[PDB]
Amino acid sequence: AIRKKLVIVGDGACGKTCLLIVFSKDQFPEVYVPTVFENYVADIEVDGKQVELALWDTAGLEDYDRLRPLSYPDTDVILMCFSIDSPDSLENIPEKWTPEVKHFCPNVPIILVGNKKDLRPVKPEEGRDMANRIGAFGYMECSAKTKDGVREVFEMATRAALQ
Amino acid sequence: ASGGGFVQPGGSLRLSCAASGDTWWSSAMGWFRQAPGKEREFVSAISFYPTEYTYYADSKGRFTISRDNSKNTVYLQMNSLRAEDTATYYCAWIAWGPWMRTSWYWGQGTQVTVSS
Ligand SMILES: Nc1nc2c(ncn2[C@@H]2O[C@H](COP(=O)(O)OP(=O)(O)NP(=O)(O)O)[C@@H](O)[C@H]2O)c(=O)[nH]1
Ligand SMILES: [Mg+2]
Structure with missing residues (x-):
């Protein structure tokens, strides 16, 4: 059918891998294993259309900045992630992650995702203001532990990629 | 993915894998493993495009990954194998191509069994 590619990016230990796995497997990973690079595949139906999403897991750690x-x-859609617990992860968005993505993939739709909302810190408008400053398709908040907001995050990603 | 066999604790084993396919080339490639019951684990990886850079997950020097450019083959040398390394070992490629989107490929996998 329709095959779109999703690449998740963001600071280390911000919830990228857990978000991808609760969406593809409905499973919250327990032991934090820093990701080097990985790939998951999940199917989703949005706006009546069936799309297979390729979830490309990336490293937030600085040791794997060449990989x-x-x-x-x-890439068809980028998931720029930060932690609501970590305010410094939000400031690394316009300093590190937006400059990097807008160089290798300058016209890809970006969705700012505030992970770990069960830990509520970053106020929701602060994240919304960041999305308007970086030029994102939209701003979403989720928590992989509570499995809340996960579906809507990837429904917005499929919407932006289907365009 | 080839090279898997039955080893004793402390034994060695070298796995082999094609560095790139025919209809595609690889900008990077990694080794993964799947224990019985456990989930997929990252073992090692190398990069091709920027420079030949290696990436491991233990920093203990047990696993060594290399590329023989003559045979177009990546090797994963494993020394001092223990029963905790018993798993199916897969290969992954970041597949590039003239008229294909950059895709993620999974190899077939080879079985490794350490005694005890
Ligand atoms: N409470 C809570 N913890 C979460 C949530 N999402 C992730 N975590 C925790 O945050 C830690 C990091 O998770 P992880 O998904 O590995 O983040 P990451 O961005 O992939 N790290 P890396 O960049 O190294 O691959 C883990 O301890 C995980 O359990 C969430 O929604 N709620
Ligand atoms: Mg990750």
């Missing part, structure tokens, strides 16, 4: 760019090419 993560290699996952950007031919």
Whole structure:
């Protein structure tokens, strides 16, 4: 059918892998294993259309800053993630993650995702203001532990990629 | 993915994998493993496009990953194997191509069994 590519990015230990796995497997990983690079596949129905989403997991750690760019090419939608617990993760968005994505993938739809909303810190408008400052398709909030907001995050991603 | 066999605790084993396919090339490639019951684990990986860079997950020097450019083959040398390394070992490629989107490929996998 329709095959779109999703690449998740963001600071280390911000909830990227857990978000991808609760969406593809309905499973919250317990032991934090820093991701080097990984790939998951999930099917989703949005607006009546069935789309297979390729979830490209990337590294937020600085040791793997030469490998993560290699996952950007031919991306259909970017998931720029931060932690509501971590205010410094939000400021790394316009300092590190927006400059990097807008260089390798300058015209890809971006969705700012505030992970770990069960830990409520970043106020929702602060994240919304960041989305308007970076030029994102939209701003979403979720918590992989509570499994709340996960479906809507990837429904917005499929919407932006289907365009 | 080839090279899997039955080893004793402390034994060695080298796995092999094609560095790139025919209809595609690889900008990077990694080794993964799946224990019985456990989930998929990242073992090691190398990069091709920027520079030949290696990435491991233990920093203990047990696993060594390399590329023989003559045979177009990546090797994963494993020393001092213990029963905790008993798993199916897969290969992954970041597949590039002239008229294909950059895709993620999974190899077939080879069985590794450490005694006890
Ligand atoms: N309470 C809570 N913890 C979460 C949530 N999402 C992730 N975590 C926790 O945050 C930690 C990091 O999760 P992880 O998904 O690995 O983040 P990451 O961005 O992939 N890290 P890396 O960049 O190294 O791959 C883990 O301890 C995980 O349990 C959430 O929604 N709620
Ligand atoms: Mg990750």
